[PDB]
Amino acid sequence: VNSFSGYLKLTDNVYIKNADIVEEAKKVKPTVVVNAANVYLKHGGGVAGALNKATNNAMQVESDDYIATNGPLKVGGSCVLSGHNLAKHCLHVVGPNVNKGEDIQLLKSAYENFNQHEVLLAPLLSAGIFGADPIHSLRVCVDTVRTNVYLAVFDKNLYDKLVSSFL
Numbered sequence: 001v002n003s004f005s006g007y008l009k010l011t012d013n014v015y016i017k018n019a020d021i022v023e024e025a026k027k028v029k030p031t032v033v034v035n036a037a038n039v040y041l042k043h044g045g046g047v048a049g050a051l052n053k054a055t056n057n058a059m060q061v062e063s064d065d066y067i068a069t070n071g072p073l074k075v076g077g078s079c080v081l082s083g084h085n086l087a088k089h090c091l092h093v094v095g096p097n098v099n100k101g102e103d104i105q106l107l108k109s110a111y112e113n114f115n116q117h118e119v120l121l122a123p124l125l126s127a128g129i130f131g132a133d134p135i136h137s138l139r140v141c142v143d144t145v146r147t148n149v150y151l152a153v154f155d156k157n158l159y160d161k162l163v164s165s166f167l
């Protein structure tokens with residue numbers, strides 16, 4: 001039993017809700033919140049900009065030190081950093097950005113990072129400003145993630161479409 005509330009169950013391990021991931025994280029304080037990161041951990045907009053804003057820019061400060069030490073992530077890769085006031089940990093995961101020309105096949109590799117964590121609150125990778133089809137992202141999530149994932153979808157219209165079209 002966990003504290004996630006109001007989710008629709010899609011499969012044995014995947015759950016979905018129309019919710020603002022920032023507000024959901026602040027309420028649940030999950031062990032892991034997933035950020036829709038880029039390789040530079042520049043949290044300017046989309047989910048990343050919102051999460052970082054909610055940390056009063058502490059996420060960005062921590063991220064800049066991480067990059068100065070380690071260099072950029074790989075597309076499809078991840079790193080674990082602090083969750084600040086939102087969660088114990090933040091798993092920064094880089095899905096391919098279609099608006100940069102990145103290989104959509106890397107979306108499966110990106111979701112594989114979730115399997116290193118027993119339970120996660122997450123957005124749909126590569127959705128939103130990353131330019132991929134969210135219906136496809138949900139399919140890859142369900143077919144790749146084996147751990148327990150609670151998906152927050154900000155847009156109510158998109159949430160309804162994801163549920164109604166789910167096979």
Ligand SMILES: Fc1ccc(CSc2ncnc3[nH]cnc23)cc1Cl
Nearest residue numbers: 020021022046047050123152153154
């Ligand atoms: F400044 C802000 C502006 C917007 C929000 C809503 S969170 C959100 N944004 C974008 N895509 C998503 N996918 C799942 N949740 C989200 C929070 C803050 Cl703090």
